[PDB]
A paper describes a structure:
Found in both prokaryotes and eukaryotes, aldehyde dehydrogenases (ALDH) (EC 1.2.1.3) constitute a large family of NAD(P)-dependent enzymes with molecular weights of 50–60 kDa. ALDHTt contains an unusually extended C-terminal arm forming novel interactions with the N-terminus in the quaternary structure which interacts closely with the substrate entry tunnel. The ALDHTt monomer is composed of the three domains common to all ALDHs: (i) The NAD(P)+ binding domain (1–125 + 148–261) comprising a Rossman fold, (ii) the catalytic domain (267–458) and (iii) the oligomerization domain (126–147 + 494–501). However, the presence in ALDHTt of an unusual extended arm that wrap the facing monomer through H-bonds and salt bridges shows for the first time how the tetramer is not merely a dimer-of-dimers carrying out their functions independent of each other, but that the interaction of the N- and C-termini in CS-related monomers may regulate active site access in NCS-related molecules.
Initially, when we solved the structure of the native ALDHTt, we noticed the presence of an extended C-terminal tail. However, in the native structure, Glu261 has the “In” conformation, associated with proton abstraction from the thiol prior to substrate binding. As previously observed in the human ALDH2 and Ct-FDH structures, Glu261 is suitably oriented and within a short distance to Cys295 to act as a general base for its activation. In addition, the catalytic Cys295 side chain of the native structure is observed in two different conformations, the “attacking” conformation and the “resting” conformation where the side chain is rotated away from the Glu261. In the native crystal structure two partially occupied and mutually exclusive n-octyl-β-glucoside (BOG) molecules originating from the detergent used for caa3-oxidase purification; are found deep within the centre of the tetramer. They lie in a highly positive pore created by the oligomerisation domain and inter-domain linkers of each monomer. There is hydrogen bonding between the head group of the BOG and the positively charged sidechain of Arg127 on the junction between the oligomerisation domain and cofactor binding domain which is positioned directly beside Arg126 which we believe to play a crucial role in tail orientation and thus active site access. Another intriguing observation with ALDHTt is the presence of BOG molecules at the dimer-dimer interface. These BOG molecules have been modelled at partial occupancy which suggests that the detergent molecules sample several conformations in the tetramer’s pore. The negative head group of the detergent molecule is attracted to this charged pore and then becomes trapped in the central cavity. It is tempting to postulate that this highly charged pore is not coincidental and that this is a possible allosteric regulation site for ALDHTt which allows access to the substrate tunnel of each monomer.
Numbering used by the authors:
A (entry chain B), B (entry chain A), C (entry chain A): 1 to 529
Write the structure that this text describes.
Amino acid sequence: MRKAAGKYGNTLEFGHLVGGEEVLEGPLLERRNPSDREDVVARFPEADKDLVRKAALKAREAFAEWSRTPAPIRGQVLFNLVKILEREKPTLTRLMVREVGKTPKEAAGDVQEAIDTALFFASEGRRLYGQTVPSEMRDKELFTFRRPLGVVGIITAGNFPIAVPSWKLIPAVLTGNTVVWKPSEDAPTLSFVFAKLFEEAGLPPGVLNVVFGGGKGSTGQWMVELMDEGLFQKFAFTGSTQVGRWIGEVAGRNLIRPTLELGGKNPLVVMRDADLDLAVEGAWWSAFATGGQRCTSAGNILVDAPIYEEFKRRFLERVEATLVGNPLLHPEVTYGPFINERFFARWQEHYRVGEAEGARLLFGRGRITRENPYPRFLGDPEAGLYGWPTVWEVRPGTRLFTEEVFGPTINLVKVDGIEEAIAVANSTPYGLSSAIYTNHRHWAYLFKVGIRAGMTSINNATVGAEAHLPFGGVKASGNGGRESGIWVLEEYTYWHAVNEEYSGRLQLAQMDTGYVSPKAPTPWGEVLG
Amino acid sequence: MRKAAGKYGNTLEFGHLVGGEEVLEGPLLERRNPSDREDVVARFPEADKDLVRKAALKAREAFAEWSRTPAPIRGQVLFNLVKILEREKPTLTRLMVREVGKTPKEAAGDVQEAIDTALFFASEGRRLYGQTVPSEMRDKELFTFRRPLGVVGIITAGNFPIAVPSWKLIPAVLTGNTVVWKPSEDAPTLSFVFAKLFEEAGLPPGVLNVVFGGGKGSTGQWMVELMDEGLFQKFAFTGSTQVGRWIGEVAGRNLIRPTLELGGKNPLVVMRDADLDLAVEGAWWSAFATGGQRCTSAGNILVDAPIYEEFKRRFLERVEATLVGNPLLHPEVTYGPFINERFFARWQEHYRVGEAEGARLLFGRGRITRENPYPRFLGDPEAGLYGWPTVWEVRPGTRLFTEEVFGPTINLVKVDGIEEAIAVANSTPYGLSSAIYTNHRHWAYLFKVGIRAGMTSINNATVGAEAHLPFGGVKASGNGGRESGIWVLEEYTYWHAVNEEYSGRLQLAQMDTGYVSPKAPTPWGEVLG
Amino acid sequence: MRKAAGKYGNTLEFGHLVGGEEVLEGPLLERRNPSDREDVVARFPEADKDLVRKAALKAREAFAEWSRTPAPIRGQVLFNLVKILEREKPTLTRLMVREVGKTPKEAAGDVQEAIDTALFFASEGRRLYGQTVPSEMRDKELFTFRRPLGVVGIITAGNFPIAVPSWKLIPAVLTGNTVVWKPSEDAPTLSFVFAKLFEEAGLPPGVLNVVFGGGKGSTGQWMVELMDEGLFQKFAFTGSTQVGRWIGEVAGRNLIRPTLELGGKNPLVVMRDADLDLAVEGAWWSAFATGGQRCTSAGNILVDAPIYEEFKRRFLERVEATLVGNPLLHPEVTYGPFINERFFARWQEHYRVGEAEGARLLFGRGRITRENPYPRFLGDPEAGLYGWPTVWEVRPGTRLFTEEVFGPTINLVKVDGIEEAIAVANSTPYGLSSAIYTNHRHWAYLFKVGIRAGMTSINNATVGAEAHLPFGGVKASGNGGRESGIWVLEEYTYWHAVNEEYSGRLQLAQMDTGYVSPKAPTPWGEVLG
Ligand SMILES: CCCCCCCCO[C@@H]1O[C@H](CO)[C@@H](O)[C@H](O)[C@H]1O
């Protein structure tokens, strides 16, 4: 790599990581600081299909030795990574604030998720339990083993540039797979550095390959297409449902079960008996954490009729207090810029769609500019794409209600009773996260069994999942796979059933099984009388 | 249903089972006894897309009440089925001999697999374990629950008309799902009866719907296409890889992980130190059980060079002793007719492909006729499609070596040493079953870790998997899913992670976590010696 | 603590660790370097019953806050310990060579076991899985949780002064318990330092209390007796079966299940087909690792008749090559001194018992002195208690065959065939470790299912268990408990079953359960053929 002086740090120039070598091949892209476009964070090439193919073949070559490396040793590599991530947490935090516009508080939590993941799977090296199973035949033993799949293709987004990649990278290599990783073009430096920390931790060259570039019409797409050439035995993707469906399609015909985290429209229910201040804080954080650029961000606040006016009043008050700005210059802000222009553009459009379909705009004036200033802004709004906190009143069945919109926007929806709250909460193509604020035992229970969601919070935000629960969605949010904890092992391994015969005879199961039949029954009705 | 007298039993006329009602709608198909075309087993309608859609909506309606039925009660229904299958085993055995041409011995084992499955999952009703998980926050609890998916679409083959459907039907309903089942047109009576046994066991109407018909251009295809209309939350299919890839494709874009069992080309290795008589018997049974119409049937016998001539001699001797015939009239036969004409046709062609590519035909003269008689045939060969036991000598890389061929055919392949045996055993697009005969600890181990297969037998056949191990293949044989035992629960449920807050505060994971930092270290090198 | 200059390092003076405070109360004991009596390693007090009682009450006080500390945070403390043990491994290694007379190679492996344990349970903080279980009633949920027991009393030996204590200390505190630890008077410095490393890692004061002293008539005994006062909710002990039975007795009447590792007489079988050089090396290492002062040390080498003379010849040759000496001055030695005089005394007596009962002494002349020199000795044999490598030929049923003897001694026993090998291998009151050397699949299997032992090695030593398998013995070697891995969690937690009702009615299990009865059966025998 090379470095040059920049505004808020060095501008990094680096290439793809392929077979341990740095490959500077392809038209140069750059990543500008989203808080300040004058600050250039990285310059990096776009990998073409031929280079991704080459990376996949380097991964296949490295897979042989790596899969044969004892899992406890592979786990000790991850343990090295835990120490290295701990050491580098402040540096990675600072780089993440700069590269994707996260607050230092959130950026540290993002790095911490990777540390948590690393520690969890470091120890998993001495687990990866299969089963010993009793044969129905004598002189025979049955076994199950978890085996690695091969080469994993990974495409990740930039909103969680260390945490979410770690959910895939760490289990993948722990279970004995090799990886080709196409990180978001919004967080290439973090991705490059993270790959180098793996190298420092002792991960053999070629086990992790990083190929930079865009998505559609670019490296991301090339990578999906190479599933047709048999170069990936597994695929993982975070992004939109639209793209996920196509990846599911390609994976499906290549007999791959992809890991798909495909976003959501996450209902947060506030029942009449709720702790209003707690529910307001939870709804606020659910909506505006990461500037609403999380898959788990609250989409709709479903508020029970009797507290609707009081909640709206308190919620808008809380929303109005939100600090927005350059988090590098003003750490205390709740959120900073949009991660990229694509998200900003879609978010600008949702104002027009909302007005067109009769949503009531309670708060928000679109992009924050010097001409259109936001009272609690800190820094220069012209330096990047920053969005007004935005609050709507919407009806079910509308586009603002059903469609995911990354960015600082949230809808209030009036409901009456737990039955309607559940029905309305499920009136969305998605089913990722969910939440209900209530002190009512029974309502909490009804919501928990009534919601169709991968994750449910009782008196907690739709965001901030703990790193050691299964993470994933139902309906349009996923395809059944789960990340994190013990539940992700199904994603990166396959079951190998072994039966060992010692009888020296061909014994047929279900046919030669030595089942004992019952004896003649005693007439106990008559004996006991 | 209606019945009329037939040659070897009553001819059954029945319709689709939809919402509890019998629906006799659609152009009539018939199933003739494959051992004797004069014996008509069943007449049944072909369901059009509209009726399958209606069946899927009946399943969705029944799902609400059935998923809310406590799992231990759903398990007690399966326990009722265990008793009913036990009672009906002789009747089902006889019907299976008649309808699909299995031997009574194999037909009983087929019914027994369903009984084993039924008993396993009857008890699973009081298991279905999720987890309690410790929160990193105080006054907070984490939980995981297994939830049913919804409506399961099931398409099954006729080669295992009770066993293999039970692998899907039983776990599906146990886990709280409803089912639309499109059984093979080769085993419609068995399927109808099996569905009625579920009804007798107390399965509520609409939880299992059966729609009869063909595959391509027919009910099977309509059923796959309805995944695009959101009518299936899960899909299971047994059949060819070609069809499986298409089903995987459709499932994939609808964010479904299908259960796909897609056949194999199963290597059986005989090492130089093997028990020859045992390996011969295992190779023979692996090749000719069910007339080689199993997904797990041996495709290639890989024989170690030093025992090659001796094994070939003993194997051909064993093959020559094989009895073939109408298993209804001659129970003692090893195998009877082809299940259908599709399998017979492909099997006839493999002679021409083998000769064309220079395979050496050691034994077999194609279809058994009066003109082309087989010495050990019993009954009338003109009454159905019966195949000569067929043995080839082939080279790796040839079509006979790589391509699956249902029917009584097997290849011998010369290998030298465990390294070559493993490499050649993996030189196939498939990876379902596998086997090695050896007394050498180390060779068994190398094969076990070297093979790419879902299942491996040490000194046992490639066939005859025990019903309580995970069943499934890698590569072209499957997509990662497993059937049977605890491993199939992932197929018919999704994980629901619930976090419950009691702290009355918004606590952020990874950010507010109360991690304890270390104290000042003592310089022990200096303090001690 | 205080330090003074000594021969091979500083002499440490320290007191008991009770509630965070160092308590220098009680008659002073000392630990002399077992390799060199002139080198005084430590001076430390003997805790009386009143101080142990006080330590137990400090543990009870600390238990409240520590058990309420989230398990993931408790795990992060262990993760701190992993880093600290890594840092201190060279220092701990050196101290262990000095204090208990282990070779540097073995001492490092001992420290590494603790690091392995620490890492395993660091990650267990985010596991400790209980279950969610489906109720047979509607509107009801079932849960299981692992809860800590309370205060754990731990008594450990000095032969594995870091490894074996870590097996108890680490899981105990991870699962939320507090500990009173009575370490061996043979390794008080290591124990003091290990406790201080826990303190450095952030373990709250009082969660680990260390009380030094002897066993019988001393601190060890006082500690067992306090189970009668309800001060321990759990107890763990490593030592002799005799003492273990008494501890089991006291624990039993106080409704405690103690963790008891009680030594063994570990059979190593060498079958006629074995790799002789490998079996010789394994038998040699099994016998003389730690100078035969392991619970898992080989007691009897059972050699198959046809290879008996050849094995004896090669084994005695290998034994004769054994280097013995001061491992601080000569790291390359296989073993050094006896850990204590108790073990030396019993080992001296076994010569007299062996001769008395007609055992044939093949090799060994008792204590190594200048008068009685050993050819391959390095250093001064007068400086400590060093034992000749000792090899016997014995018959089954004799005291040398059945009774555990710590120290460098081993018996050869002639057997003929796997049946006799198994019977003779089981002809001992113990059942800890076991091993068989064979290339015969079937013999390995028969031994594996025929042996009565907690642990069995196939073509591996009776020693050197991997730290992530369950460790423990049957018969006189233990009481059912297992240490290490997931299996030790049962030792330090109890199951809490919770049922939550939401139905608003009293529903009786087994009585009000809504079991569905079967429908009227169809006579299928008659309906079909
Ligand atoms: C990693 C995916 C989650 C694993 C689910 C819990 C696994 C627990 O394994 C359990 O073992 C029990 C012991 O008899 C069996 O009875 C249960 O069927 C089985 O679920």
